[PDB]
Design a protein around this ligand. Structure first.
Ligand SMILES: [Mg+2]
Ligand SMILES: [Zn+2]
Ligand SMILES: [Zn+2]
Ligand SMILES: [Zn+2]
Lengths: 171, 84, 177, 551, 112, 97, 270
RNA sequence: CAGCACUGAUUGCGGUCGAGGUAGCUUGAUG
């Protein structure tokens, strides 16, 4: 799943920062505007690999003010989920509707009806949980889900995941 | 397409339009508080300083000359001759 | 934004965007056949957990190093060592990355850039598409029916037996906690 | 420019793809149904009916709302609306092609009247250049008036080959007003080609035929020269105009639409009631009429489609037409800020590159200098000076994007400039400027001078530079434009300055010399016969500012 | 021989007035009218029909009409026309803009 | 005052590229619209506050740009539309040459 | 119209005159690559005059007591009289100036020698003259190789087109030709010594400026030559304030319109 | 750009030059 994609950004520099160590300021800029971002086109851009050889190429000066625009060609590590994907994580929350699991930077939620029959939700339990003849899903317990669908949104991505299928559940 | 430093074919001199625009652009930056690479012998008018920078060929810029077909040749202020 | 090395002349009619699934049909942005900046083709890059834990770290550390070249002028263990390395080379607002280290550090199935190596040399010879070659190496697996089920894109592709061999050896080279 | 940050990227325009609107798109774009012809008055009450101008489109009354897009008047461009017609209608200007089309393809089955099979044809389909590859097709299809079913191939003129078929005679066609007619040849048989019909025959045209004929599969399909849905330009294109309040102000356009609207509904209310078959095409022609005149109005078929008061009306085409109109009038040439004009007079005391600006003008025109350590000092003195003493300024602007009006502000005397703020100051001795005299037909008709602030109300220029702008002082008026960007200036001072203009390329000779007094006199003084004595040879020397101080 | 003629015939109009103009200009006009095939007029009939962009031929004697048949057969504009840009409010590939300018961060360090 | 065609004609002659852009824009119309990277139109519903964008119909939200053009022109376009003509505004060339 | 019809034309970085399509209109603006501003009227001496006068001016024969350079000219002259290896260069010089003559007479049939050309040579010397205080008495110090050999190396540096190949480096010659004729015309050995006593120092000097001032007379990739052209025809069309045939303002219109029915048809026959 | 302000002068009426026509006429250029 996780990825390593080759990307490229464009930053506009205002004359002021036209110093001896500009190369240095660009990079940092590149970082604050990419590390932590989100899109449906790329997923989560988590970290910029190889920091040393980041390409800045020659920068061209706009034409009304003195700013310059550089096309910074970098490389990084990304993560974008998929319907039909199978990943496992840690539960985090739980309620009369299901429990939310966490697969890395992302979170997959599971609907009460999108899990097994014989598994009921217990109200007065504390912390909240679901019980089975043999299973006990709750806070820490590590599960393993199947992402039935992915939904993009602002600065993140979410998904509904079932565990009704086989070989799924907790481990 | 891009052209290699060698095989270059344009005029080795600076077009009156280039220089006019370099002084301009340069000044603008200088007037925007950009850093100056020359000893200001006391000047205060940006275009003045600009002309000074251009006289000590210490302006960090590059003229990309586009050809009819789309390719282009790159020349630095440093390289070009400033006759005029 | 960020632009992804492929320019398709979007002539208005932007209607034909296919679905997504483990049918190996991933966005137009992840064809196995994808281009590298140099201008050449280069197979997709599938990172399996733990295999990423290192890349992130390796280049994250080298960042620390060089971040200073310019300043002169065990489960519950790596969990803290990693927390610091971040609070020194992270944007501090990258809650996404932190949380991505725990996960990446608790669920990792390996720990040596040697073992990981084997995994790779081993796995790669299958001809499997990078996505499989990752999931296969990041998901506990004992029975083919277990893998070829949690990874339906395999089915016809391999042979129940040999896969069982591979799986059988993974758990062997599976480093101990 | 426009103000307010936009988290959007910014690029320039490089390609402009021209095309026609697809009734499907028009519908897609809109945000307003637009079903009522009325303006607003929810029964006299003031606002707007979810009917015409603002059924969600733009806005009036200086109020946010632009489909929550708020921002208000200055920022919210228009938001198109549509208006489902009742029955297809031609497009005033395209009629001509639609005629040229049907003549190029027989109806009933819609397909070319000629193929590779006809030699005189091949040579036509080759011509790569739609524009000509059409007046080639059409020129060889208005003549064929039969939809042949079999043509002799390249073989024997004895052997016959087949393609498609249905020889229903090709009816020659003529333009009678806003409709099309054709006979079908003992004795003729005349009938009227219906819009609805025409559309269909086009709707079936082949994709390979499109192209053969001058079109494009995605940007312009012939089945679009016929209108179905009508896009409604939002207010900003047909702004209101209010005489305070309790009064109208509606733009010519807003009405024409309203006319098309009225003239639409009645042609529908008749298709669901007493529909006297041929007493409808007497009310449909009205729509094709309004919709036609809305766009073009000076049609050849006399009736101008007048409007109460007998004032012709302003078709859209009228707004873009020759000079004093959009294209040539607003885009190719504009009115502009930072300009001035008055009378010129001579002055044998300014250098060549100078120009006398009267304090009055000098106190109005302005330049934006950016506070920098190189001048904080200098600049602050101006801001204090205020906008009444000459060397002064009249507007300080902080990065925050807000204007300080030096002539009012309770902090006028106060203020402490900030490295980065701009200070619009008065033009001062030596601010280069573009000075000109119309008509402009010379490079030199416009040149750059060094400002020199003088008194009295006239632009002062040096004799010699007179023949270039070509001007006398018998009350001739001149123009001046003030630069604005450090880089702009440079452009004037580096290529537009006068000292540069001395030698002229339109005749490889200098285009400036000594004239009148200065000339006539230079001669007298020359003569051998002529001698000057000490008590004056000393004053003369003094006058030359570059004198080495050596008698 | 036509170009020769044409020029000869134009020069004589200016020469009859003691007016003088350096070859090159007239020669350019002569050439412009003569390239394509033979005699192409400096009028709404000729020069303003060629493959030049749309928005250009658009600012001269046939405005609306030209734009109509422009979208009709979906033209495309390069935006190389001086006019084109002016209409757009962008700097034109004109002298000062017949090239680009760039900051070579490299050399931007040797200067210190 | 007026910067007529003839005057334009002149600055083009001098090759005073930038100053011409200055007359025409910064000192007159000068305005900014939001475009779509697909249906090259002025459809975008730029809420410029909470950022939201969109050209439903071309249905976007991601590939949106913004140019700077003379309001006059904005109008020329809008008018050309109400007459059913599509003036597409694209920021990258494809035809090359 | 003259305007709108030529807007988009401008000189490009390859020294080609093109419009907005990319269409060549000229391959070298003006057919010479020179900027209208740097061009004065210069006379081409090599053209007019009796075949006799020509000989007496550019002919030098080191094998004839009456057609050599009196030792009062070239310092090292008495020791050249008769030299045979020289007379071969000295013969090339003449066999060229003559080739020139015939050429020019095939371009300017009128025999008109005054024309617009860059780099005013006449003055370039005049300065060299009083800039080195030359005395028409004492001899020179220019080798006969020196003269004839520098003049050759000079032409090799008057560059318009740069190109690294034949097609271009060929066009180069063309674009310079006429000038060089004027060049050899004035830097003729006889001339360079009997008419304007130049020293080695001086001569060397003249050559450098001719080279420099030339390079400065080229055109700048960037000029909007089209509009320039238009106006240049147009402005002089209003100063028109008015042996019997159609001529003037209405005739010009006749032209541009390319009308078939001109008021005056006429035609001349020889 | 003769002149008016009758219907909205951030523009109608109309005028002059030029072409086109069977004309009981279109406009291209034109404040
Ligand atoms: Mg007068
Ligand atoms: Zn709005
Ligand atoms: Zn048929
Ligand atoms: Zn869109």
């Amino acid at each position: 799943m996780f990825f390593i994609k080759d990307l490229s950004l464009n930053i506009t520099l205002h004359p002021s920062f036209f110093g001896p160590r500009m190369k240095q300021y660009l990079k940092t800029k590149l970082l604050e505007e990419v590390e932590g971002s989100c899109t449906g086109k790329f997923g989560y851009i988590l970290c910029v690999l190889d920091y040393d050889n980041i390409d800045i190429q020659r920068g061209r000066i706009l034409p009304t003010d003195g700013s310059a625009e550089f096309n910074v060609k970098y490389r990084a590590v990304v993560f974008k989920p998929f319907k039909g994907e199978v990943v496992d994580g840690t539960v985090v929350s739980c309620s009369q509707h299901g429990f939310e699991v966490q697969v890395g930077p992302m979170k997959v939620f599971v609907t009460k009806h999108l899990m097994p029959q014989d598994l009921t939700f217990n109200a007065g339990s504390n912390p909240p949980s679901y019980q089975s003849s043999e299973d006990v899903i709750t806070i820490k317990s590590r599960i393993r889900v199947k992402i039935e669908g992915c939904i993009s949104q602002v600065s993140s991505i979410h998904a509904i995941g079932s565990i009704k299928e086989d070989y799924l559940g907790a481990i | 397409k891009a052209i290699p430093k060698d095989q270059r074919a344009t005029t080795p001199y600076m077009t009156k339009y280039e220089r006019a625009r370099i002084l301009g652009t340069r000044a603008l930056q200088i007037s925007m508080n950009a850093p100056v690479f020359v000893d200001l012998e006391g000047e205060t008018d940006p275009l003045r300083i600009a002309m000074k920078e251009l006289a000590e060929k210490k302006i960090p810029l590059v003229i990309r000359r586009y050809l009819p077909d789309g390719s282009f040749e790159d020349w630095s202020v440093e390289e070009l001759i400033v006759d005029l | 934004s960020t632009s992804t090395f492929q320019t398709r002349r979007r002539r208005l009619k932007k209607v034909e965007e296919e679905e997504n699934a483990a049918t190996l049909q991933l966005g137009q942005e992840f064809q196995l056949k994808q281009i590298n900046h140099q201008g050449e083709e280069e197979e997709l890059i599938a990172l399996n957990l733990s295999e990423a834990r290192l890349v992130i770290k390796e280049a994250l550390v080298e960042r620390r190093r060089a971040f200073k070249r310019s300043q002169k002028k065990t489960r519950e263990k790596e969990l803290e060592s990693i927390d610091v390395l971040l609070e020194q080379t992270t944007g501090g607002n990258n809650k996404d990355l932190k949380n991505t280290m725990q996960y990446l550090t608790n669920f990792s199935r390996f720990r040596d850039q040697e073992t990981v190596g084997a995994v790779i040399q081993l796995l790669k010879s299958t001809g499997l598409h990078p996505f499989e070659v990752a999931q296969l190496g990041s998901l506990a697996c004992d029975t083919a029916d277990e893998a070829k089920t949690l990874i339906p894109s395999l089915n016809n592709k391999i042979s129940d037996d040999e896969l069982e061999r591979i799986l059988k050896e993974l758990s062997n080279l599976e480093t101990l906690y | 420019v426009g103000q307010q940050y936009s988290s959007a990227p910014l690029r320039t325009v490089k390609e402009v793809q021209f095309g026609l609107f697809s009734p499907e798109e028009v519908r897609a774009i809109s945000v307003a149904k637009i079903r009522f012809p009325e303006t607003m008055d929810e029964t006299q009450t003031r606002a707007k009916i979810g009917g015409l101008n603002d059924p969600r489109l733009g806005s009036i009354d200086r109020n946010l709302k632009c489909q929550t897009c708020q921002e208000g008047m200055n920022e919210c461009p228009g938001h198109f609306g549509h208006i489902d017609l009742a029955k297809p209608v031609f497009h005033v200007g395209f009629i001509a092609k639609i005629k040229k089309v049907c003549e190029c393809v027989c109806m009933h089955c819609g397909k070319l009247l000629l193929d590779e099979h006809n030699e005189l044809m091949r040579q036509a389909l080759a011509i790569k250049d739609s524009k000509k590859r059409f007046a080639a097709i059409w020129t060889l299809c208005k003549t064929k008036m039969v939809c042949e079913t079999d043509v002799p191939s390249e073989d024997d003129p004895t052997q016959l080959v087949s393609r498609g078929g249905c020889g229903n005679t090709q009816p020659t066609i003529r333009k009678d007003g806003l409709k099309l007619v054709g006979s079908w040849k003992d004795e003729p048989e005349l009938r009227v080609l219906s819009t609805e019909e025409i559309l269909n025959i086009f709707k079936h045209i082949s994709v390979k035929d499109f192209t053969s004929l001058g079109f494009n599969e995605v940007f312009s399909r012939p089945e679009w020269m016929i209108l179905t849905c009508l896009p409604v330009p939002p207010p900003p294109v047909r702004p209101s105009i209010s005489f305070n309040e309790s009064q109208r102000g509606e733009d010519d356009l807003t009405f024409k639409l309203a006319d098309i609207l009225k003239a639409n509904i009645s042609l529908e209310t008749l298709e669901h009631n007493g529909a006297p078959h041929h007493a409808i095409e007497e009310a449909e022609s009205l729509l094709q009429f309004h919709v036609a005149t809305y766009m073009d109005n000076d049609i050849a078929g006399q009736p101008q489609a007048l409007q109460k008061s007998g004032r012709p009306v302003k078709s859209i085409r009228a707004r873009l037409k020759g000079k004093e109109g959009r294209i040539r009038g607003n885009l190719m040439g504009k009115r502009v800020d930072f300009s001035a004009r008055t009378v010129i007079s001579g002055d044998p005391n300014l250098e060549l590159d100078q120009v006398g600006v009267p304090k009055s003008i000098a106190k109005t025109l302005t330049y934006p200098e950016v506070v920098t350590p190189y001048n904080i000092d200098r600049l602050t003195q101006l801001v204090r000076n205020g906008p009444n003493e000459h060397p002064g300024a009249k507007y300080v602007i902080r990065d925050s994007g807000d204007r300080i009006d030096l002539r009012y502000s309770k902090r006028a005397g106060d203020i402490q400039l900030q490295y980065g703020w701009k200070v619009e100051r008065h033009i001062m001795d030596n601010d280069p400027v573009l000075f000109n005299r119309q008509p402009s037909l010379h490079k030199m008709s416009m040149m750059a001078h060094r400002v020199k602030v003088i008194p009295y109300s006239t632009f002062r220029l040096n004799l010699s530079v007179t023949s270039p702008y070509n001007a006398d002082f018998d009350g001739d008026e001149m123009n001046l434009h003030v630069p604005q960007s450090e880089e702009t200036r440079a452009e004037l001072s580096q290529l537009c300055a006068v000292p540069l203009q001395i030698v002229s390329p339109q005749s490889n000779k200098p285009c400036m010399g000594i004239v009148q007094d200065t000339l006539c006199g230079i001669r007298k003084l020359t003569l051998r016969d002529t001698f000057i004595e000490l008590d004056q040879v000393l004053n003369m020397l003094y006058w030359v500012p570059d004198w080495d101080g050596v008698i | 021989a036509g170009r020769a003629a044409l020029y000869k015939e134009v020069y004589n109009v200016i020469a009859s007035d003691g007016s003088y103009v350096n070859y090159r200009h007239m020669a350019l006009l002569v050439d412009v009218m003569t390239t394509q095939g033979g005699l192409t007029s400096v009028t709404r009939h000729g020069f303003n029909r060629s493959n030049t962009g749309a928005l250009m031929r658009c600012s001269f004697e046939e405005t609306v009409e030209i734009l109509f048949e422009a979208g009709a057969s979906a033209e495309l504009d390069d935006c190389r026309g001086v006019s084109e840009n002016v209409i757009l409010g962008q700097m034109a590939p004109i002298g000062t803009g017949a090239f680009d300018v760039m900051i070579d961060e490299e050399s931007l360090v040797k200067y210190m | 005052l007026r910067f007529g065609e003839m005057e334009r004609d002149c600055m083009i002659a001098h090759g005073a590229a930038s100053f011409l852009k200055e007359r025409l824009m910064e000192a007159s119309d000068a305005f900014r619209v939001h475009i779509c990277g697909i249906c090259g139109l002025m459809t975008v519903i730029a809420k410029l506050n909470h950022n939201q964008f969109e050209c439903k119909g071309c249905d976007n939200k991601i590939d949106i740009y913004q140019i700077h053009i003379p309001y006059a022109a904005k109008l020329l376009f809008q008018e050309l539309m109400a007459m059913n003509i599509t003036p597409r505004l694209y920021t990258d060339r494809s035809r090359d040459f | 119209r003259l305007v709108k019809a030529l807007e988009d034309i401008m000189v490009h970085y390859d020294n080609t005159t093109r419009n907005s399509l990319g269409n060549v209109i000229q391959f070298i603006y003006g057919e010479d690559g020179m900027d209208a501003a740097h061009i004065e009227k210069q006379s081409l001496d090599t053209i007019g005059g009796s075949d006799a006068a020509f000989e007496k001016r550019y002919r030098v024969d080191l094998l004839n007591t009456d057609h050599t350079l009196d030792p009062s000219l070239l310092e090292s002259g008495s020791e050249i009289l008769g030299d045979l290896k020289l007379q071969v260069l000295l013969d090339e010089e003449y066999k060229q100036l003559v080739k020139d003559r015939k050429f020019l007479r095939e371009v300017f049939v009128d025999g008109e020698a005054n024309w617009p050309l860059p780099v005013n040579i006449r003055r370039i010397i005049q300065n060299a003259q009083q800039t080195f205080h030359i005395d028409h008495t004492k001899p020179s110090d220019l080798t006969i190789k020196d003269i004839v050999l520098g003049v050759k190396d000079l032409q090799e540096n008057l560059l318009v087109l740069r190109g690294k190949n034949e097609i271009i480096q060929n066009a180069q010659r063309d674009a310079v030709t006429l000038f060089c004729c004027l060049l050899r015309s004035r830097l003729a050995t006889r001339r360079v010594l009997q008419e304007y006593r130049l020293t080695k120092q001086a001569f060397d000097w003249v050559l450098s400026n001719i080279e420099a001032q030339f390079l400065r007379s080229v055109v700048h990739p960037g000029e909007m030559v089209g509009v320039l052209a238009a106006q240049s025809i147009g402005e002089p069309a209003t100063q028109m304030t008015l042996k019997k045939v159609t001529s003037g303002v209405p005739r010009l219109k006749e032209i541009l319109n390319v009308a078939k029915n001109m008021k005056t048809p006429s035609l001349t026959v020889y």
